[PDB]
Chains A and B, each alone.
Chain A
Amino acid sequence: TMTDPIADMLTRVRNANMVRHEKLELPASNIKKEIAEILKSEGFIKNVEYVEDDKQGVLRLFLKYGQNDERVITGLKRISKPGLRVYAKASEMPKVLNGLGIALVSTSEGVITDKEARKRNVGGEIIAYVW
């Protein structure tokens, strides 16, 4: 069973990191779409794209590798995984590698990045660590 979307998303991202290619697509979710937009905002994904097809539309990512096809980011991992519904309140917000390392957090309104998290000070279910 594909238990968690975050897990497969991030393991295939790390797989592409190893294989050093950018254009990859995957069946999304609305949350996957929004976090991919956050990725392009962060930049290390040069481009993201979303369409619709069975069942959720395929999210289409196009990474921003380094100048020599290096990971601009360093590390990446899920946090909220099956069984572990793990939440963080305003002060419980973590700072992987401070500002450099980042993490979106789902909050009472939606998914927001670590900067947004400690900025608007609404905690929530911490999602996944990327650094």
Chain B
Amino acid sequence: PTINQLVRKPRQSKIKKSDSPALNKGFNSKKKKFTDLNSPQKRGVCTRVGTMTPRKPNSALRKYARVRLSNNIEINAYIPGIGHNLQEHSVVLVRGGRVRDLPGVRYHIVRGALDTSGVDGRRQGRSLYGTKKPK
């Protein structure tokens, strides 16, 4: 652009929006004040659990669940991983993740530390999967 119009303008960038609406507790539990908390985790419950079916050929049956965290904001979220012992209205920790299974969702639960218990039979959960070192 010309120098003058460059001056009378900011040349604004194309700054993005976080595709993860991770508005953590912030001021939810006083004044219900919306607050952009970037917490990597909030405690909260999946009030309902479900299971959408994938199409062929990989009929890798993926299971979903609708959850409320500390802010209690509705979202249908899929469960990854093998093995669990939770049910309806069980408290669950959900991490940010978008996978190839189904649109309309951009988060994912984590295994091991809460009602959706992981499995300690593998060795990949040695530092993760919520489960301790397989000893």
Contact = CB atoms under 8 A, between A and B. Distances in A.
Interface in A79-99: 83-84
Contacts of A84: 3
A84 B2 CA distance: 11
B4 interface: yes
Nearest to A81: B3
A85 to B, nearest CB: 11
Grouping DSSP codes into helix (H, G, I), strand (E, B) and loop, the B interface class, with mixed when no group exceeds half, is helix
Contacts of B2: 83
B82 to A, nearest CB: 65
Contacts of B3: 83-84
Interface in A54-88: 83-84
A22 to B, nearest CB: 35
Contacts of A83: 2-4
Interface string B110-129: 00000000000000000000
B8 to A, nearest CB: 13
Interface in A33-73: none
Contacts of B4: 83
Interface in B1-21: 2-4
A83 B4 CA distance: 8
A80 to B, nearest CB: 13
Nearest to B2: A83
A127 to B, nearest CB: 18
Interface of A: 83-84
Interface of B: 2-4
Smallest CB-CB A-B distances: 4 pairs: A83-B3, A84-B3, A83-B4, A83-B2
4 contacts: A83-B2, A83-B3, A83-B4, A84-B3
